[PDB]
Symmetry: C2
Subunit: 220 residues, 2 copies
């Protein structure tokens, strides 16, 4: 499993999104390097202007690329669910606002690691921070708290994303997560420490997101 | 199973459609009466103007509501799955044109019978009859040939839809179908028969969204 992440691996991400009657498709390409815990990705909305802000889709759009330092390798479930992969499901509750529900399969298809997702968004207020496009084009650092789910031969994860709002206020987004292996390890409690920059290609006419991200595992 | 169709039952239909990079959502509501084999439905495209003609979605958008006459009740698989429901999968090949692949779950959610579908459309020619919106706003009668698929505890079905085209020609659409029960309970596996179908497509004159009003009569025969 780990053997497949020694060095740079090409990435493909695909998202099916349906939110309050509005539909979108997002394709992402780039590279991941799990030895340094770095992702470099460009995402394009093939269906035109997104009906939701790009930052709300960051956590949905490969943890497999988190850097697990040598003393924590035995706690890296994401790797070793390779090459068959794992199913990542989440419910994301936006405080005072609407909810995303997601399902995804992360796996190898040849040399490329692929993340295919379906996203359903419900009960979002018109003129809220999400449908109103009131979220700043940035992202903050978080701790992703991971625990083992022995009964589903996998893991649960809990976190709160902090979305900055043009207002000066903050939009919270409580993430509840589950991962189960597709094919035939289970960690003690730890967390992933995350950092992310969102930018734009200045020559790109389509609605898009350039993303650089660093993630490393800690807490043992 | 059959017990649940004695009266008028409210219907909900939902379609996820992805065709040649386009994407759309269709919500449908109305009523079905299986005693007379009648559907009355209104469909709305919540995502704007559909990238494909409404008639191409008709077969994808509740055969449990077919009328099975008393002498054929033991051959009605669709109702015997219920209320737990069945999975309806199809491949639809359009002659000289691109194909749909569909998957759907038909089941009860409370009193409402619900049909939730995913549709993938591939290899459709731009300025063909489908992407070019060249199909007349109507629908024809067909025979849906049903056979038993004992090995999947369900049924296969085959038929060809005839879509009239504005030029006077016809666009054929070969349907290949499979149904399997969602539940573990027993179901009726039928001897070969067919469903006879008739359908009218109309518009609500007060509806500004892209939509389809549909009235349909279907009865089972051929024993
Ligand atoms: Cu979709």
């Amino acid at each position: 499993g780990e053997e497949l992440f020694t060095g740079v691996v090409p990435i493909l991400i695909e998202l099916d999104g349906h939110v309050n009657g509005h539909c979108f498709f997002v394709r992402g390409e780039g590279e991941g390097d799990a030895t340094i815990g770095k992702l470099s990705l460009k995402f394009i909305a093939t269906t035109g202007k997104l009906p939701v802000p790009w930052p709300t889709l960051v956590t949905t759009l490969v943890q497999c690329f988190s850097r697990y330092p040598d003393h924590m390798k035995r706690h890296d479930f994401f790797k070793s669910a390779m090459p068959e992969g794992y199913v990542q499901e989440r419910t994301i509750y936006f405080k005072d606002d609407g909810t995303y529900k997601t399902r995804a399969e992360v796996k190898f298809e040849g040399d490329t690691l692929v993340n295919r997702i379906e996203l359903k968004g419900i009960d979002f207020k018109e003129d809220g921070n999400i449908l109103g496009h009131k979220l700043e084009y940035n992202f903050n650092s978080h701790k992703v708290y991971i625990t083992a789910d022995k009964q589903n031969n996998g893991i649960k994860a809990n976190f709160t994303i902090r979305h900055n709002v043009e207002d000066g206020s903050v939009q919270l987004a409580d993430h509840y997560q589950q991962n189960t292996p597709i094919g035939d390890d289970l960690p003690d409690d730890h967390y992933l420490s995350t950092q992310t920059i969102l930018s734009k290609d200045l020559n790109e006419k389509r609605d898009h997101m350039v993303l650089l991200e660093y993630v490393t595992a800690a807490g043992i």
